[PDB]
Amino acid sequence: DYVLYKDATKPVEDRVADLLGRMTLAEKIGQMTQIERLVATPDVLRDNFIGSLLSGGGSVPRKGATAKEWQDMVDGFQKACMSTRLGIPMIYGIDAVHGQNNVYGATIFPHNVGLGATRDPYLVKRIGEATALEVRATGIQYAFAPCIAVCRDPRWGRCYESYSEDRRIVQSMTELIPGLQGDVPKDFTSGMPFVAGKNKVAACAKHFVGDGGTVDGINENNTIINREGLMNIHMPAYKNAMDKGVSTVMISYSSWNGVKMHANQDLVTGYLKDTLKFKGFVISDWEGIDRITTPAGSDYSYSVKASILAGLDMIMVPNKYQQFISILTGHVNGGVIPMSRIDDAVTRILRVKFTMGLFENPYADPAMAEQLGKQEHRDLAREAARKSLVLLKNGKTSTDAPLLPLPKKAPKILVAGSHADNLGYQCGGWTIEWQGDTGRTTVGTTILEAVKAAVDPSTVVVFAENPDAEFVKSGGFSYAIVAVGEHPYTETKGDNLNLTIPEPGLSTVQAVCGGVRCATVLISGRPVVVQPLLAASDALVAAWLPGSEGQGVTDALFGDFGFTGRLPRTWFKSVDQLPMNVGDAHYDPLFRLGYGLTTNAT
Ligand SMILES: *[C@@H]1O[C@H](CO)[C@@H](O[C@@H]2O[C@H](CO)[C@@H](O[C@@H]3O[C@H](CO[C@H]4O[C@H](CO)[C@@H](O)[C@H](O)[C@@H]4O[C@@H]4O[C@H](CO)[C@@H](O)[C@H](O)[C@H]4NC(C)=O)[C@@H](O)[C@H](O)[C@@H]3O)[C@H](O)[C@H]2NC(C)=O)[C@H](O)[C@H]1NC(C)=O
Ligand SMILES: *[C@@H]1O[C@H](CO)[C@@H](O[C@@H]2O[C@H](CO)[C@@H](O[C@@H]3O[C@H](CO)[C@@H](O)[C@H](O)[C@@H]3O[C@@H]3OC[C@@H](O)[C@H](O)[C@H]3O)[C@H](O)[C@H]2NC(C)=O)[C@H](O[C@H]2O[C@@H](C)[C@@H](O)[C@@H](O)[C@@H]2O)[C@H]1NC(C)=O
Ligand SMILES: *[C@@H]1O[C@H](CO)[C@@H](O[C@@H]2O[C@H](CO)[C@@H](O[C@@H]3O[C@H](CO)[C@@H](O)[C@H](O)[C@@H]3O)[C@H](O)[C@H]2NC(C)=O)[C@H](O)[C@H]1NC(C)=O
Ligand SMILES: OC[C@H]1O[C@@H](O)[C@H](O)[C@@H](O)[C@@H]1O
């Protein structure tokens, strides 16, 4: 007879109910299961009725794989899922958090902290739009973004993934969501999931909740704050996300007042679902349920029970799916987890899938492959990089001529520093590899290349990575641009109690600036100890992690555009002050939140 869920003309809720009522326990638990591509095969996906796959950081079909190779991979997985009895398509997720950043040749946008510095939510919306196109170029339908953490301590390894320490700025930047997913209708009910169709992706507000509030910025640790503070600082942007139809929410590894987020029924069910009326699906973080216990994974039966009862809908296993499915099945067979809970999880997952058009367009569009790294998107990334720059100093004394903007025509100029010609360093973490990487890891323009592309043909450009003082003094240079900073890092690898840049960095700046007037470009995911760099430099720019389009840096250095970026975080005098945020009592910043010198074009 007629099969309602297969009818594209029927209301989403009708299709959801019709499908749900046909499903066996195994088919239902399969929907709740997300697995890594590294453990997926056609048989595994078919036999276990798997609902979702992901690429973790750096999980790629091949180094340098083309957009078509990605499409072929995703379609091969999809063909297996479509061959099941019910033919429920899988959704494929990826960390596309500053462009489609795992993918070779993808446009790499500035990281979130720099986007916060722009104070330009419409720019961020356009970045979401471009990112959706480059993710669909690879056949992928779901991005784990935006991170709406409010980082309250820059010692956190994920501080660069937060737009600001000020929740008001984070709230404004939730415009990424309708960029990625499309604008919601006039009639829209807050909390409903939304994706416009095959040229957009499902988004993910992460990580719920208070991930940016942990003690000493220790990643995955304890957020100690009363309910009022949780609701005033860490929660507000989630409500904006509901208003804009975010399709999914990912749960944080962190704890609130000692209670693991992955086990918190009061917040996940009581608040997110029952109070905010979220109707999309809730997803775990990677082995998030394992990490409920100490040691992690020491009581997986408990992990499954606690997380599913808390209200999570889809589990990013991501590897041991056999164990996950077996344990959840036993819990349901034994009455420990009621069918109502399973039915709720599956309802939400299917709602998102039907809503986004996944049943109508389960396969990749080969015509989208050319969106990957499209020059228009690079032009946008270049605009964003330029807008993100914060000018901290532009002259050593009030009577000095301003160094910036620099003249494009000069007999000879020096470009120096570990970060001047290093594409991986200027991109930072979550770029090609999970942790990011060093060197020419993808398609882009380094600071050095951008300088050579900007200057007059008569201008001789010299590169020296770490020149000594004599080299500089003897070189006959008009000025120098010197770029130094943090190395790429991600998650716990980024946790840092000292926030001092690696050497050589300061020594290079001192040697260069001692010999010629210098503009120092600081590449970092966060404020770092900066007084010694300031003391040496004529001008200093906080460029954050500007991404693949290094011409954004030179656009401002050479005065094509004026500097406009303003600090989205407090710049501390010392790490012993931390945590120290705008609005605190005894706030004693080196540079307050909102600080930024300006220049004018030309
Ligand atoms: C303040 O606190 C931070 C964070 O705890 C410390 O940084 C970390 O230091 C530890 C060592 O004490 C380091 O762990 C070792 O890493 C070795 C490899 O390190 C290099 O590669 C990784 C990426 O694989 C980079 O993240 C590192 O920064 C290193 O990179 C090299 O650095 C040198 C010096 O600038 C440079 O010349 C090279 O070009 C560069 N190479 C690359 C590939 O970029 C391991 O072999 C070893 O077994 C340890 O695990 C850890 O990586 C550091 N973290 C980060 C994010 O840099 C600071 O030391 C500390 N500072 C002070 C003032 O105490
Ligand atoms: C020399 O540089 C000056 C400093 O950058 C610049 O003056 C600024 O101009 C911008 C507009 O281009 C002003 O920003 C606006 O501020 C309003 C609130 O006061 C907002 O309602 C606007 O939306 C806008 O805000 C910006 O929106 C985008 C976001 O990303 C930015 O962070 C945000 O600031 C800014 O306030 C001016 N700064 C001050 C304090 O003067 C000069 O150009 C402008 O001069 C101003 C005063 C104005 O008359 C403009 O018409 C003019 O373009 C610039 N001089 C020249 C000749 O270009
Ligand atoms: C927040 O971070 C702190 C610091 O890492 C965590 O405390 C640490 O917890 C681990 C266990 O997960 C402890 O390691 C264990 O120590 C015991 C005792 O010697 C040892 O027998 C085990 O083999 C294991 O290595 C560690 O000692 C402990 N450190 C400190 C300084 O207390 C804490 O659990 C985190 N909290 C949250 C909520 O995530
Ligand atoms: O890679 C998938 C997930 O992995 C986790 O470890 C990170 O915390 C998340 O931000 C990410 O979305």
Author numbering: 1 to 602
Sentences from the paper on this structure:
HvExoI releases a single Glc from non-reducing termini of oligo- and polymeric β-d-glucosides to support seed germination and plant development. HvExoI folds in an (α/β)8 barrel (domain 1) and an (α/β)6 sandwich (domain 2) that at their interface cradle a 13 Å-deep pocket- or crater-shaped active site. A vital conclusion drawn from the structural studies with the native β-d-glucan glucohydrolase, isoenzyme ExoI (HvExoI) isolated from barley seedlings, was that the glucose (Glc) product released from β-d-glucoside substrates remains entrapped in the enzyme active site until an incoming substrate binds, presumably lowering the energy barrier to facilitate Glc displacement. We discover that through chemical signalling, the incoming substrate evokes the formation of an autonomous and transient lateral cavity that serves as a conduit for the Glc product displacement from the active site.
